Amino acid sequence: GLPWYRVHTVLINDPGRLIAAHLMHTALVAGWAGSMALYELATFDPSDPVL
Amino acid sequence: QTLTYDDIVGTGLANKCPTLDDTARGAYPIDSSQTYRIARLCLQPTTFLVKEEPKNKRQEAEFVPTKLVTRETTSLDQIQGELKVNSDGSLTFVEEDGIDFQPVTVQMAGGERIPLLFTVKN
Ligand code: CLA
Ligand code: CLA
Numbered sequence: 001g002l003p004w005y006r007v008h009t010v011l012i013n014d015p016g017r018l019i020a021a022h023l024m025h026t027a028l029v030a031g032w033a034g035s036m037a038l039y040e041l042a043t044f045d046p047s048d049p050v051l
Numbered sequence: 052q053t054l055t056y057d058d059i060v061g062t063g064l065a066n067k068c069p070t071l072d073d074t075a076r077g078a079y080p081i082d083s084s085q086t087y088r089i090a091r092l093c094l095q096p097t098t099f100l101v102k103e104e105p106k107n108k109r110q111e112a113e114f115v116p117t118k119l120v121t122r123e124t125t126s127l128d129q130i131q132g133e134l135k136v137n138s139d140g141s142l143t144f145v146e147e148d149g150i151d152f153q154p155v156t157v158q159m160a161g162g163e164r165i166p167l168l169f170t171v172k173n
C-alpha cells in the first residue's frame with residue numbers, strides 16, 4: 001500500500017481528478033474567506049476609527 | 052378635493068396633512084376684541100435625526116439620520132386648542148385635545164432601534 005505521506009500521488013496521471021482536487025481546494029479557500037469575514041463582522045466595533 | 056374614505060384607504064394618504072396651494076400666501080387678520088381657536092392642527096414628520104453618542108474623548112456629537120421602521124403611523128392630527136391674543140400682541144396656542152402622540156421606532160446605522168413618543172401633549 002501507499003504510505004500515508006504519498007496518498008495524493010494517485011492524481012499524478014489523472015488530469016480530471018487533479019482538476020477535482022484543485023476545485024475542492026479552491027472551494028475551501030473561498031469558504032474560509034467567507035467564514036472569516038462573517039466572524040470579523042460579528043465581532044467588529046465600528047463606532048470609533050480614531051482610537 | 053372632497054375625497055372619501057374609500058378613495059383614500061390603503062394608499063398612505065391618511066398619514067398626510069392637507070396642503071395649501073402654492074399661490075396661498077396672504078394673511079389672516081387678527082382682532083384683539085375677538086377670541087380664536089385652532090380647529091385642526093396636523094403635524095406630519097418627514098425626517099427623524101438622533102444625536103450619536105460621542106466617545107469618552109468626544110469632539111462633538113452630530114445628529115445622524117435614521118430609518119423609519121414603523122410605517123405610515125407617525126402623524127399628529129385632529130389637534131384642537133384656543134388661540135389667545137396676548138397683551139403684548141402675541142398669539143398663544145394652548146393644546147386641549149387631539150391625537151397628539153405617536154410612538155415611532157427608527158433605526159440607526161449598525162442596527163440600534165430607538166423608540167420615541169413623538170408628541171406635543173400640552
Ligand atoms: C502547492 C503546494 C504543494 C503541492 C501541491 C504538493 C504536493 C505533493 N507533495 Mg509536497 N510539499 C510542499 C508543497 C506542496 N506539495 C511543501 C511546501 C513542502 C515542504 C513542507 C512539501 C514537502 C513534501 C514532502 C516532504 C513530500 C511531499 C509529497 C507530496 C506528494 C504527496 C503528498 C501527500 O500525499 O500528502 C499526504 C499528507 C497527509 C496525508 C497529511 C498532511 C498533514 C500536514 C502535516 C498538516 C496539514 C495542515 C492543514 C491541512 C492545513 C494546510 C496547511 C496550509 C499551508 C495551507 C504531492 C504530489 C510527498 C511525495 O513526494 O510523495 C512522492 C513527500 O514525501 N511534499
Ligand atoms: C484539500 C484537501 C484534500 C483533498 C482535496 C484531498 C483529496 C484526496 N485525498 Mg486526502 N487528505 C487530506 C486533505 C485532502 N485530500 C488531509 C488533511 C488528510 C489527513 C486526514 C488526508 C488524508 C488522506 C488519506 C488517508 C487518503 C486521502 C485520499 C484522497 C483522495 C480521495 C478522498 C478521500 O479518501 O478523502 C480522505 C480525506 C478526508 C476525508 C479528509 C477529511 C478531513 C476533515 C474534513 C477534517 C475536519 C476536521 C474538523 C472537523 C475541523 C472542524 C473544526 C473542529 C475544531 C471541530 C483524494 C485524492 C485517499 C486516496 O485515494 O489516496 C490513495 C486516502 O486514502 N487523503
Ligand code: CLA
Nearest residue numbers: 014015016017018019020021022023024025026027029030
Ligand atoms: C480556453 C482555455 C482555457 C481557460 C480559459 C482556462 C482557465 C483555467 N484553467 Mg486551464 N486548461 C486549459 C485551457 C484553459 N484553462 C487546457 C487546454 C488545459 C489542458 C487540458 C488546461 C488544464 C488545466 C488544469 C489541469 C487546471 C486548469 C485550471 C484552470 C483555472 C485555474 C484558476 C481557477 O480555478 O480560478 C478560480 C476560478 C474562478 C473564480 C471561477 C472560474 C469560473 C470559470 C469561468 C468556469 C466556468 C465554467 C466553464 C464552462 C468550465 C470550463 C472552464 C475552462 C477552464 C475550460 C482557470 C479557470 C485549474 C483549475 O481548474 O483550478 C480549479 C487546474 O487544476 N487548467
Ligand code: CLA
Nearest residue numbers: 005006007008009021024025026028029030031032033036
Ligand atoms: C498560497 C497559498 C496556499 C498554498 C500554496 C497552499 C498549498 C496547499 N494547501 Mg492550501 N490553503 C490556503 C492557502 C494555500 N494552500 C488557504 C489560504 C487556506 C484556507 C485558510 C487553505 C486551506 C487548506 C486546507 C484546508 C488544506 C490545504 C491543503 C494544501 C496542500 C495540498 C497538497 C498536499 O498534499 O500537501 C502535502 C502537505 C504538505 C506538503 C505539507 C504542507 C505543510 C505546510 C507548510 C504547513 C506546515 C505544517 C502546519 C503549519 C502545521 C499545522 C499545525 C496546527 C494544528 C497547530 C498544499 C500544501 C491540504 C493539505 O495539506 O492536505 C493534506 C488541506 O487539507 N490548504
Ligand SMILES: CCCCCCCCCCCCCCCC(=O)OC[C@H](COP(=O)(O)OC[C@@H](O)CO)OC(=O)CCCCCCCCCCCCCCC
Nearest residue numbers: 001002003004005006007008009024025027028029031032
Ligand atoms: C483537518 C486537519 C487534518 C490534519 C491531519 C493530522 C495530521 C496527520 C498525521 C501526521 C502525523 C504523522 C506521524 C506519522 C509517523 C510515521 O508513521 O512514521 C513512521 C513512518 C514509516 O514510514 P515507512 O516508509 O516505514 O512506511 C510505513 C507506512 O506504514 C507508512 O504509512 O515514517 C514516516 O512517516 C516518515 C516520517 C517519520 C516521522 C518521524 C516521527 C518520529 C516521531 C518520534 C519522536 C517523538 C518525539 C519524542 C522525542 C523527544
